[PDB]
């Protein structure tokens, strides 16, 4: 979905400062040519869209859309692609219409789409185009949402956005309840190795599958093991076929990052409960079991790259070497004989990755430093250490070190001798603060990872895994998650509708080979040819018992949840079921930040900004108005003088805090003197 994406801001396109809100709006020529659900949710609403599932581009650049033409009530199969003007020429009906598989709309008054966007019950003769399918209006990432036709469009928007932000876990189990658009969207995404020509597997490994084509030739599909993606995630590809199987032309042969037996899998299936548990799941917060941490259910691998170069200078050239001035030896145990750490060393924040020193020159020394060097006999040590240290809050193993050298005849930039990259990887388990979301925009951070004992368990003794909130469901208008939860419990425990006294009433519209199903069988409700709440109601009455004669979940969908904490049963049965939830890419370790004293800016003497440097938080204008509205004058004086710009005052504050003295009086900030010099330079005498 980062390809096939329509963008509306560029050279000659509309900028945001000139953006008119009319262009933000959808209007009924997007049906089939764009997706009204999926768009960015910030200030770029409606500008950036996405292509539909079935859309196509004309040779002039107009966006086609396939329709089945119907000739006099006979819905043909001449699937004619149509552009927008030609769609306005004719009238277009809908695919969810009663058809006897002979053309022949059963209802004469059919839903239809006029040119200007009108919806009329035209008699069933003037209809000349039908839709190819339902869900033609929708994008790819939204077509993977189950029960889409029950959600509000805001929360379906948030589900379609946050389905593009899952991280690939280490197990990556396929979802129980899904749509049809997972397998096709994975085999078209290119991150699954697909067997080109049919044949028999000669040999598997973790690194290669050598296939054997039916006519003599073999071919090895090399894997891609632990590649770092562009945002620092896993990219493993384990093979799924065995040493003697047969593959066909188009068979999935290797599950990529977020796949499982070929189809897409962004999260795991989890037992859910919808009760408000003890205030920890308050205002979209989610609590979890400890089973997820213990069994590595939610565990992403994050691979970060570090690199340093060795370029020349006026004083010579920088020197990657094990010998570092003024350094100890316990930090120089990770390093090998020529700089870089060994593959497999676990480093912490602030450890040496590449021992690299520069020529410094010759400066005069302070007399205290001079006599200490005279006392301890140490020399001047004319080189200055600026080594590559793994920065704060990063740790984990060292996967691989790729070093490029000017002496090895590589393509380095001018005047750079040795370029060396280091890939540090960690295994980020789940934690509180990590953002989680289902497939319906029901997002939220992790409130508290409970131990597995004091978590509400069913009568079976199965503890639930996460506990959602009730008050997030109705007022956000997505009970698609509740229908997905009920259908998840049905597909998890399996069912067998008893067609002994005939097939029952709701099951007649239901297709065959779904009246009975094994436990943990995957099903698929597509987007608008959905599950039909009456049929789901009939399903939940007829599920099969777990291991004993024991029906945990009644016909309404609620189980008698015991309490793990105190131990008495909860006095009302509680909706439980199986739910699909993804680990989002807004984890805490990327987000946490703190700085007591770090770098400073160049022109004005303010602290810097962002987690890449240290930086401090922007104490902007609205914070200043709040501090004035309290009347707190002193704190505002501190925040605007002796924590940012009173340049003598910063070291005076540090010295007085460490020595234990009073915080001294602030002075004039440096940014005011900069403004004063600017106004003086503009020929304004500012005394």
């Amino acid at each position: 979905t980062h390809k096939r994406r329509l963008l509306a801001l560029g050279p000659g396109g509309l900028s945001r400062e000139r953006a008119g809100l009319e262009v933000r709006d959808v209007h009924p020529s997007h049906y089939g040519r764009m997706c009204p659900i999926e768009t960015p949710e910030g200030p770029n609403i409606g500008l950036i869209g996405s292509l539909s599932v079935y859309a196509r581009v004309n040779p002039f650049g107009f966006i086609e859309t396939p329709y089945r033409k119907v000739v006099d009530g006979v819905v043909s199969d001449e699937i004619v692609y149509l552009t927008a003007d030609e769609e306005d020429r004719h009238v277009v009906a809908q695919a969810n219409s009663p058809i006897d598989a002979d053309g022949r709309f059963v209802e004469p008054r059919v839903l239809v789409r006029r040119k200007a966007g009108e919806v009329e019950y035209v008699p069933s003769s003037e209809v000349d185009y039908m839709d190819v399918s339902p869900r033609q209006m929708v994008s790819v990432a939204t077509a993977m949402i189950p029960f889409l036709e029950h959600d509000d469009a805001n929360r379906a928007l948030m589900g379609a956005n946050m389905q593009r932000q899952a991280v690939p876990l280490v197990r990556s189990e396929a979802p129980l309840v899904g749509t049809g658009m997972e397998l096709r969207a994975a085999i078209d995404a290119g991150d699954v190795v697909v067997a080109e020509e049919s044949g028999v597997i000669e040999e598997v490994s973790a690194d290669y599958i050598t296939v054997m084509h039916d006519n003599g030739t073999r071919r090895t599909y090399r894997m891609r093991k632990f590649a770092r993606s562009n945002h620092g995630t896993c990219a493993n590809q384990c093979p799924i076929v065995d040493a003697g199987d047969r593959v066909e032309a188009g068979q999935v042969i290797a599950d990529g990052p977020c796949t499982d037996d070929g189809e897409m899998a962004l999260g795991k299936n989890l037992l859910v409960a919808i009760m408000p548990w003890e205030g920890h799941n308050y205002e979209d917060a989610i609590i979890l079991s400890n089973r997820l941490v213990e069994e590595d259910v939610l565990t992403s691998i994050h691979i970060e790259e570090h690199e340093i170069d060795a370029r020349d200078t006026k004083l010579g050239a920088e020197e990657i070497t094990r010998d570092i001035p003024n350094i100890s030896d316990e930090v120089l145990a990770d390093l090998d004989e020529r700089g870089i750490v060994r593959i497999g060393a676990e480093v912490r924040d602030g450890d040496i990755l590449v021992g690299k020193v520069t020529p410094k020159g010759e400066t005069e020394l302070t007399p205290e430093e001079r006599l200490l060097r005279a006392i301890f006999g140490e020399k001047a040590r004319e080189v200055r250490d600026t080594s590559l240290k793994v920065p704060h809050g990063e740790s984990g193993k060292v996967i691989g070190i790729r070093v490029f050298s000017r002496e090895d005849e590589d393509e380095l930039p001018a005047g750079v001798n040795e370029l060396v990259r280091v890939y540090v990887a960690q295994k980020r388990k789940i934690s509180d603060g990590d953002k989680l979301a289902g497939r319906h925009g029901n997002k939220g951070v992790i409130g508290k990872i409970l131990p597995v004992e004091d978590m509400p368990f069913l009568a079976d003794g199965t503890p639930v895994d996460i506990i959602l909130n009730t008050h997030g469901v109705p007022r956000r208008m997505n009970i698609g998650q509740i229908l997905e939860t009920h259908l998840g419990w049905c597909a998890h425990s399996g069912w067998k509708v008893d067609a002994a006294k005939g097939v029952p009433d709701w099951a007649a519209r239901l297709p065959d080979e779904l009246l009975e199903a094994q436990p943990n069988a995957i099903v698929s409700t597509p987007v608008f040819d959905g599950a039909q709440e009456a049929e789901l109601q009939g399903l939940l009455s007829c599920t099969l018992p777990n291991r004993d004669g024991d029906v945990l979940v009644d016909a309404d969908g609620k189980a008698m949840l015991f309490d793990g904490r105190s131990g008495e049963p909860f006095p009302y049965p509680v909706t439980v079921g199986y739910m699909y939830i993804m680990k989002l890419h807004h984890l805490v370790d990327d987000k946490i930040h703190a700085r007591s004293t770090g770098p400073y800016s160049m022109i004005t003497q303010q602290p810097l900004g962002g987690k890449a440097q240290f930086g401090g938080q922007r104490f902007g204008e609205m914070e200043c108005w709040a501090m004035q509205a309290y009347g707190a004058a002193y704190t505002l004086q501190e925040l605007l003088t002796i924590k940012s710009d009173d340049t003598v005052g910063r070291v005076k504050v540090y010295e007085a805090i460490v020595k234990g003295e009073n915080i001294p009086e602030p002075g004039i900030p440096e940014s005011f003197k900069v403004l004063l010099k600017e106004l003086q330079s503009l020929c304004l005498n500012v005394e």
Binding site: D77, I79, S133, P134, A174, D188, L510, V523, Q532
Partner: peptide, 27 residues
């Protein structure tokens, strides 16, 4: 099925659409 190594995901679909989903990177 339309893909030779697909897991059998039993569908609740009542319709039958003729046009299969195109080669999504065609654009």
């Amino acid at each position: 099925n339309s893909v030779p190594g697909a897991p059998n995901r039993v569908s609740f679909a009542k319709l039958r659409e003729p046009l299969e989903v195109p080669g999504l990177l065609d654009v």
